[PDB]
Each structure stands twice: as structure tokens, then as C-alpha cells.
Design a protein around this nucleic acid. Sequence first.
RNA 1: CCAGGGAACUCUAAGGAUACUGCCAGUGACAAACUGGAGGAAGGCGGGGACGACGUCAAGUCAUCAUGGCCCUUACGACCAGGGCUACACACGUGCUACAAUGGUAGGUACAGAGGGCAGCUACACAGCGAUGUGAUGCGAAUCUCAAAAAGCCUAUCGUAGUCCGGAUUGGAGUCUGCAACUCGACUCCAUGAAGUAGGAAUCGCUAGUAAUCGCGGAUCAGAAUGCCGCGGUGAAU
RNA 2: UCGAUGCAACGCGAAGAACCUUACCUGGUCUUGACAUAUCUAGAAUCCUGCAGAGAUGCGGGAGUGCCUUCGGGAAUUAGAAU
Lengths: 78, 205, 153, 100, 124, 116, 100
Amino acid sequence: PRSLKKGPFIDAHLFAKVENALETNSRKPIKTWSRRSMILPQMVGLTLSVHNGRTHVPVIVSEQMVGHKLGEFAPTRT
Amino acid sequence: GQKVHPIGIRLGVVKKHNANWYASPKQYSEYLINDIQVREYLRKKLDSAMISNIMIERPTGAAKITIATARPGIVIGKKGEDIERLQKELTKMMGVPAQVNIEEITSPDLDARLVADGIGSQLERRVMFRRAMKRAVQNSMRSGAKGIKVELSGRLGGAEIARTEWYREGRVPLHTLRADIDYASVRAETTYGTIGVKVWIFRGE
Amino acid sequence: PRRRVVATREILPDPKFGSQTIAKFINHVMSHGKKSTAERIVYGALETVAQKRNIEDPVAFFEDVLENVRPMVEVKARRVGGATYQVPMEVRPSRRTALAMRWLAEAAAKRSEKSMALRLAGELSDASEGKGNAMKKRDEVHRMADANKAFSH
Amino acid sequence: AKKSMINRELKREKEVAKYADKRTKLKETISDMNASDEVRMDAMLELQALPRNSSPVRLRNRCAITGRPHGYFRKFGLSRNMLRERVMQGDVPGVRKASW
Amino acid sequence: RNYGTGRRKTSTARVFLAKGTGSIVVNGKPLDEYFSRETSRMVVRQPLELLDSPTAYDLYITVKGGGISGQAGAIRHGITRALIELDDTNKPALKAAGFVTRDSRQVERKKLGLRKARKRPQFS
Amino acid sequence: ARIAGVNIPDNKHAVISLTYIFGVGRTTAQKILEAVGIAPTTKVSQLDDIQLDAIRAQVANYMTEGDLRREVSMNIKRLVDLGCYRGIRHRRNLPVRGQNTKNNARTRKGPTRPLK
Amino acid sequence: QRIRIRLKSFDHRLIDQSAQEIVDTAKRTGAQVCGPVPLPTRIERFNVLTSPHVNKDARDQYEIRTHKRMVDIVQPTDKTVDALMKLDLAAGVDVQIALG
RNA sequence: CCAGGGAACUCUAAGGAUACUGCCAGUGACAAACUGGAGGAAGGCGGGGACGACGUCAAGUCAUCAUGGCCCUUACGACCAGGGCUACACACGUGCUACAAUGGUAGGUACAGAGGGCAGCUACACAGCGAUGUGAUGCGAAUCUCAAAAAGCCUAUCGUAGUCCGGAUUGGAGUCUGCAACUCGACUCCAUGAAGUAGGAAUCGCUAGUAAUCGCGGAUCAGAAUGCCGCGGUGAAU
RNA sequence: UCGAUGCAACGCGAAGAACCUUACCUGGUCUUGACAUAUCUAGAAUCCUGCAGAGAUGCGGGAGUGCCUUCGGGAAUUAGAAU
């Protein structure tokens, strides 16, 4: 998957976005096209909408989804 | 299409490469890319003159390009005025100043490229292909040769169905490796399509 | 082929007995170009029967079993104007040994003994008295040869 | 290939040389053991913040003449199609038809 | 100290024949230790016993390249090349045995479109 | 002998027989034998109760068939109700590791089913 | 002061004559020189598809050999050195100097 | 390279020698030729490759390239992010791995060729079960290295079982490459252990260092071969 | 995505699709345009920056004033002005 020494990958334009959402504790969907980012424990409980190739599918982050990519939950094919 | 290039199959037995430089595998590519760029430019900027063989051997740093034309007077110009402006231009797209020298073609009728270019020029100027093909055969045999094969392919006569017409006179034994055959495949961009011109000049084993 | 008769190759005799008959039989057991693997199979099989039957020289014993397996009449396929006559003809001597060496190896490969060297040892012993699939195969060819015994074309 | 695709490779390679030195100094910094743990992750974060085309991984080396993305040879730098033409004319030094 | 150069498909063998007891040393090691193949052992010692003189000459062989049975053929050819040095009357016998001829057989090259030297990619 | 709740062949070697324990393979068997100190070549039949006990105690460290079947089931179940990509592949009985689905997936899709 | 010349070209008949005068110009100046030892040549082969579109079984096999030679000046002289820079050979063969 | 520093030999790579039905015996139109024999490393085309006649299939390629005509020009041109070319009720074509005892596994012990290496290979040491990680060394190479060749040989074991065969699938934990390994990478470790016990009609390759079998390289390539192009080892049957 | 379609298409173009390659789709964008010559307005190019954005891009601030000829100015160069 990824070397542990290199640390968990998080996109530059997503780490700031979730950081700003923590301050307001908003529940509005966060529109993102970056599904390569890993799910951190700081984003548990908030809702963000990942691109599926066509639209932005809403995903509600739970405690048992930390450690996965955002694209795990945005199916592309039918 | 089932005939090998008669120049490449002879490259070691009775012929010589028109490039004589050693470069390292890292540096080999950029020389060759630079080497090919010279050929394309020199074939367009010097189109008026009839040039057949351009040998490009580059020593350490420099580059001794050796064109073999049949009209040195118009390549060189008055007291070499035209060659010098080409000297400063070839160097601009190459490395350190590279000297260019011109070789003389005693018989501008035994070279396949020169014969092929003439046929290509004639087809450009609305000349019936039968007469252009036949004359080049006559000139080459009368100029001293042991075989000529000229082949014209395309919409000959501006027809809709292309066909290949070829007139051979002599021997031109393509399967003999020690044959010294001059080959050239040039084109003729007519108003009805490209016409391919292939010329074989057998000049003795 | 269609025109010539290519010369047959020379085969070096086996290193433990110096006979070209055993070395040719090793070629018939070998697969995948593994000469040594087949040699211990043949040597082990020959040693087993030699150690059991109390015979000092087993090259002559292998000749006895080989001559007891070699067929003399084979049934060829012939055509006369669209009719198929299964004419029985004689077997050239080079083909006799090849057929016998072939049948022994193929009959021993379907035995029930533990090891192949033991499987081959059983067939060599069984064919020595005149039993086994190898003997049965020779009879089957001879049965078909006697079955026609009427086309002498 | 298309004229745009050839030029797109040029601007994709322009950045590679423009951040060529920056990556080399950065690469040692993030791999340096003696560098502090917070030093190296900050530098590695910057590596992921550089322009995307700046990496030498998005480069697809291509034929100089025609721009063919397939059949490329490193020694010659030309696609398979144009290399055969130049070899058979004799324009490539040393190279000839092989048979053994 | 007659010298013979032996060659086989890819192995070159140099032999130094000399009158002695009959010991054979290959690459500084005894023949039996070097060659675990009984076939290779017999092939190496075949020319010596062909003309009824196995224990007459001491051998010092140094083989290189090739494989475990190609080296045996190389040694046999080299031993032939060395025996023909002391006496020219053995050459008829060795030629009749077929040991004077160097086998030109080599691994045929793989061909394009083919899977091997001759194997073809089956069609249907 | 009966080890870890299931009977294992007694005539086979100890290292081979322990592989019959669901959740214990060849190298786990080797590591078990080293801790106890029994030669792997020894058969299960010639095992004293004292050393048969020692093997049983050591097997408790590695997860046995009972617990592991749950955990594997829970791990697979965790994906199914999660709805992830690996989740939807597990429920649909299709390969989960990005394997060719056009040509060869018959070990994950069962026997080839004829189509009218 | 034992200088060693190293020659590398693609054409084999170009180095035999190139080394021949080097071993002659260094032996006609009252010096002893050993002959050019040929070192194993590098043979790079290539598989170029002839057709522009289809039928991968139609290809040419090109090869480019790289021959290498070298000579030793076991004992040099001032009249052997001064003959060596003026022997400016280029265009086909690369000449390397050890200078020691 | 190593016979006794040597200039022998092997090797390396340039130039040559030999082979020509040249000699003998026969057949054959007083022939071309053929059949055998000597000498020689080689015998009759010594083995292999490159070289593919006039034409055929309006065969393939307008997507390598060029090119006549036709068509689009705030778009059928252009840039970017994400997806996708990797989907799966299925059928077909090429292969790879197997179904085992001529074999699996664990210890020792040998024998190659060819090719690559600064867009790198890595001696050696240490940490690691391992992929690999850190330090450090030699090498633009006949110097240093990839790299140990594997099949083979000796000993033990398994004893015919869906198994100590087979290694698909799946669960867990990791290493590298790369901005980034979810879609959709390759490896490593542990666990699981699927079908498969030799395959219907039918059908294919191969005439000798060939088939069969065993490993080792390279191009493309940041990473990604069971494909391709090569290299040698053992080595048939007819 | 497209091509290859009986032998002679189907491990074929492709000597190697995570992005790129990519030619397809969803969306976000540009219009003499990523690229060539006709031109005239300023400037050596070039380097380091800030914010906003998924990115393409958009809006702003600092250092440098080439070189040969020299007061016509020239090989290159950034942003249009139109055919």
C-alpha cells in the first residue's frame, strides 16, 4: 500500500479544508475531487462528497473508516 | 511490399554509412536527433541545387558535413558568399562552428537521387509520365551504366485507379550483394495525389 | 521422408554394461532430456531382477525378454481402389526392437508397484516367463495378423 | 502524434528541468536521518505541493521526428517507424542488419 | 608432455598427456570427484581404453565453459588430439572410432515469430 | 491425538500434522516445535502426555480455528456492512484484489453457468 | 609515464588502421611498443517492426558493434611524446589517454 | 591466460588458409550427373541466418509519417482535475502453472553462455523471518558488479493420499517506486488452501543439438512479463 | 478510445493504461489559440513571492537592465491588435 516511514498521505488542498471545518464544526457537505487521500481520525463524523467520476456521492465519515482511501466508498462502475 | 532497401542491405559489404561519429549511449541520441535535423533543413534550404549524397562526419567538437551536388556554383555563389551564410546558420542549430565542404559530381546522371528528382520535377510540371520515365532511362544508359530500373507508382496520368509502371534496361541485379546499386525513392506532389518515383542505377559489380 | 534414406545416428553404449541395446532402452524411458534419471530407473530395475533371480550377467537376460516380446508379423494399412485391406506384413528388424522396447516402457508405466524402477522390474520379470501387458500387446498384434491371414498383396 | 501532444510534452518537460535542482536538494533532505523528524515531513509536504508536471514520472519520452509514443529506443531517440527508414538509408552510424 | 586442445558445443578442454601410471586429474581434482556422471566418466576415458592403454599415460586436464557432458566430449577430443602427438599409427583407429572429428553441433538460435529454434506458436 | 479441539492424524510427523489445525501452517508448526523442543521428524503417535500438553499450551498463543474463523468472518463482515469497494465485491462474490473479471474469475464466481 | 591509448569505434576496419599508425609512430621514434590487444566487442542488437500497423512477426534485426583496442608505451621518450599530440585523429574513433 | 615472471596454451578480435566432385572405384548418351571409398575439423547445399522474381489478394496501414479530395474553425481545435481503456450471465484465440514418486521438502556439492550497469550495478558490514533498510567500496567496465545458474549429484524423508501434490482465492501485517498503489502496481511474511487424479468430438508443433525439459539475460521501463527478442545446460523417438 | 477479422485478426499496433501515455467520459475552462511567418507598441530574458481554486488559471508585490552596433537599431523574449 504505502511505506509507513513516508507517513499517511493527505492532499494539501484537503487537509486545510477539513481543518477549517473543525473550527466551525459544520455538517455541510465538503465538495472534493481528491479521492486518493487517506481518512484521518480528525475527519470522523463530518460529511464530505467524493467524486465518483460523474457526480459527488455523499459519504458520512464513521470511526471504522479511518485508514482507508476516500475512493473506497465512491463506486465508479455499475 | 516485399523488397528490402538496397542501400541498407549493402551497408557493410560494398557501401559506407553517410555518418561517421562515435557517441556515448547517453550522447548518441542527441547527436542523431541533431544529425537528422541537419538533413531536413539542408534538403529544403538547398532544394534549388541538385544534391544527392550528404555525408555528416563530426569529429570531436566540429562537424565536417560533405554534400555532393552537381551545381557547386549556385551552392557556393560569388566567392563563396552563399556557403558562408549557410556556415553561420548550420552552427546556430549545432554545436561549435562546423565546416561544410562540397564534392563534385562528374556525371549527374548515374546518381539515383539526381535522376529521381528530375523525374519528380517533370511530373510536377504536367509532363506525361511515359515520356519522363523513358527519357531518364535513355539518359542514364547513354551516360554510361550497366542497368537502370525506374518505377513510377501512383495516379499516373491523373487517373482514379493507381498503378505501377516500371521500365528496366540493363541488369540491376538486386540480389547480388557486391553490386554497387544507387537507389532513391522520391515523390511528386501533383494536383491529383502523390506519385512515388523509385530509381535503381546499377553501375558495375 | 519422400526422396532419400537419411543415415541413422550412432548411439553410445550404456556406461555400466557397454551394450547399445540397454542404452537404446534408456532412451525409451527418458523424458524431458533427463538421461541420468532414466539410467537409475533402468539400472535399478535390472539390479532388482538380477538380485532376485540370481543372475550375474543381465544383458543376456534382457535379450531373452526382448526376443520374447518382439513381434514378427504386423498388420499394415493398404488401399486398393478405395478398399482398405489390413494386409499383415513382416516387421523389419530395427522396428521389431523399437516396438518391443516401446511396449515394455508403456506397459510398466501403468503397473502398481511403488517405484518406477520397481514397476519396470516387475514387467521385465513378468515378460520373462511370458505374462504381462507387454506379452498381451504382442499377442494382440499377432491375433490381428492371424485374423486376416488372407491378404497377401 | 497530434501537434498539441508534442507541445504538451515540451511544457511538461520544461517544469521538470525548472524544478530539477529543487527536487534533488529536497530528496536528500527528506531522506536524511540526521534531519529532524519535523524537518523531513515539512519538506516532504512541500514535495507533494509542487506543480504536478514537475516530476520526471509524467514524462513519456517520445520520437523526436514524428512524436510516436510507442516503439521508442533510448539509444537512438527515434520511434521504430523512422528508425527503420534512417537505418536502411545508412544515416545511422554503425547500425546495420544483423544475422548470426 | 604432448598437448591437445579439446572442444565441444561450448566447452574448451586442454589436456597435457604424459607417460605415467594412468592417473587422471581434471581442474586439479580427480576425474571421479569432478564428474558425478558415469556417462561423462566413460566418455572421458573412452579413447584411452579404445587402443588398449588405459593405465599408461598420466593426464592433466583443465576444462572451461560448457556443461557437464559437453566438457566430457571436449576432454575426449583433447585426449585424441594429444594421443595423435606421440604416435601417428593410432590416428586410423581413433578416426575409425570417430573421436578425431570435432562436433560442430551447437544450440540453434531462436528465430523471430518462433518460440524456439524451430517450435512454432500453434494456430487453429 | 486431539489438539486445539480437533483431532489430527497420529501417524504423520508432528510438523505435518499440526498443519491440520485451521490457522496453523508449516512455519507456525515449526515455531511451535522449537518452543517445546520436540524434533519435527517425531510422529504424533509417539508423543507423551507431558509434551502433548506443552504443544497444546503453546498453540494458545497463535489464534486457533475457533477465534480466527470469527475474526476472518468479522473482518469480511466489517466490509460488507461498511459499503466500501472491497465490501461490494465480497457480497457480490467477485474478486476483490483487482483481478481480471472478463476472462478468469471462476474461483470466485463458482462453476461456469451456461447462458441461454 | 607509461601512457596507454584506448580506442573505441563502431567500424572495425577503421581502428585497425588507426591503431596501426599509432603503434608505428610510437615505434619509429626510437621507442618500444606492444601491439594493439583487441578487447571483447559490445554487440547491441535491436528488434524493429517493419510494418507500420500489424503483423508483429515481420521485424528486422539490427546490430551495432563497438570494437575496442589499446596499446601500451612501456618506455616513452620525448621524441615519442611530441609525435603524439600532432597525430590529431578524429571523425570515427575516440582516443583516450592515461598520461601516467 | 598460467605449461614451464612466462608469450607456451585457452581466450579475445582483425587478416587469411581449407572444400574444389579436387583424387579413386563403379554406373551413366564416350555427357550432365549419381553411388560408394580415401585423406581431412569439415563432402558433396558442412549447420544456421540475411537476402523474398513478375505478380495475387481494390490484403493491412489516412492512428508513425507524407499526401489528393471532403469536412470542423468560441470547435470535431486547446488546457486541467477526476474516472476509464482493468467492467462480467458468457464464448473464442494464444499461453503459464499444475494434477505428482522419472516427484515434493530439508541439508550439503558442482558445470555455462549471452547481455546490462552514472536514466546505474553493487563488494562488505550491520538490522531484519523476508521483500528490503543504513553505512560504505570497486567500476563507464575482459578491472567492480548484476550473480547464485537451474535441471544435475550424494543423504534423509514422504509411500499413493486430493496427500509433505497442487498454489487459485481470501483475511491480517509490511517493503519499494512514484505527487499519489481505492478504482488499478510489483514484491515479502503469516494464515486459508479452490478446481485439478491426465482431459469428448476435434486439433497443433517438431527430422538433431531438433522436439522435450531447465534456468539466465535484454528492449520497452520511476515501478509494472506467464508476452516479445535472445542465451546457454541436459537431451531424445521415428 | 481506435485499428487488426480465413489461412495471412485475436500475448496483433501496444518494446510494457495508477496520473501522463489517452486518442473515450463527467465537469471546469481558452479562442490567432499549446505551435509557424506577416506586424507595430514596452521590456534582457530570467528568478523568487502572496492569496483564491481540484487544477487549468485569476488578481497583486520585490531584485536584474542584456550583448554587437550606438542613437535606425538586430539573432531570443514575455503579455495583445487584427486580418
